[PDB]
A = this chain, B = another copy of it.
Amino acid sequence: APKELSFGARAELPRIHPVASKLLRLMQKKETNLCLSADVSLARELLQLADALGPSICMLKTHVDILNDFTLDVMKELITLAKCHEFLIFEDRKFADIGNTVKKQYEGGIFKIASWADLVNAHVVPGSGVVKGLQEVGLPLHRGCLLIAEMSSTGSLATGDYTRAAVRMAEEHSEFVVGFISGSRVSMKPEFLHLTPGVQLEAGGDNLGQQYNSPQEVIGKRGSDIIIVGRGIISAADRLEAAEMYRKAAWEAYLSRLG
């Protein structure tokens, strides 16, 4: 493997996407490679978490279709927090339809996801039309996309040639695609981010197929860039001290890998 570059140096790579470079520079400024999976159903709790944990995170990942009281003004308030504390907003929509449909789902409907999400993600199962359709909205809005190359869950079919196809599709749509959701490093090109869910400090899983690995395993041994942490933080009593524990774990694993 080529010699590892710092996040700050990766932010300067000739082929880097502007959204990736903004992310990489705030990761190095803030010493955080933690993405908070803000898995709550109340706008107040989402906003209180974003404000308190904002300084500790590089990214806040939302499922806005689980917010009981979603409005676009909630997302305006989230953007204010994102700008104040310096983190990106990633809507974990997992687009997975034909290109003509995802185009509408990204721009339109109640959620107007493209209006407030810096990043979205997509499954590669439909073929590259899924990326084509999203990019016809996302490119004019200066957004980025992550392709789901592997999943954390038991029985995942995102393996082998499927994973290779995701990497190829990302390479070929680099104007819009900034990286992967994956369990490890899947691309050797340093311009691409790797974000990894299924992360907790302790061993375990849930009863619906989620499986966990630690920040040291995921960042240090498996070579990913960012950990996505949900229940490990959200279910804790003190979510701020939980986020700090995850931040320091992921940051030190990165530093020790960087040498």
A residues neighboring B (CB under 8 Å): 39, 41, 63-68, 70, 92, 94, 96-101, 103-105, 108-111, 123-130, 132-133, 136, 148, 151-158, 162, 165, 206, 208-210
Contacts and interface: CB of A to CB of B under 8 A. Distances in A.
A239 to B, nearest CB: 18
A125 B65 contact: no
B99 A65 contact: no
Contacts of A148: 125
Contacts of A125: 123, 125, 148, 151, 156-158, 162
A208 B98 contact: yes
B153 A126 contact: yes
A129 B110 contact: no
23 contacts: A63-B105, A65-B65, A65-B109, A66-B104, A67-B110, A94-B96, A96-B123, A98-B152, A98-B208, A100-B208, A110-B110, A123-B123, A125-B125, A126-B155, A126-B156, A126-B157, A126-B209, A127-B154, A127-B156, A129-B154, A129-B210, A133-B209, A157-B162
Number of copies: 2
A100 B230 CA distance: 11
Given A127-B209, A132-B208, A208-B129, A109 B68 contact: yes
Contacts of A130: 153, 209
A129 B155 contact: yes
Contact of A210 (B98, B154, B206): B98
Contacts of A152: 98
A258 to B, nearest CB: 30
A68 B112 CA distance: 9
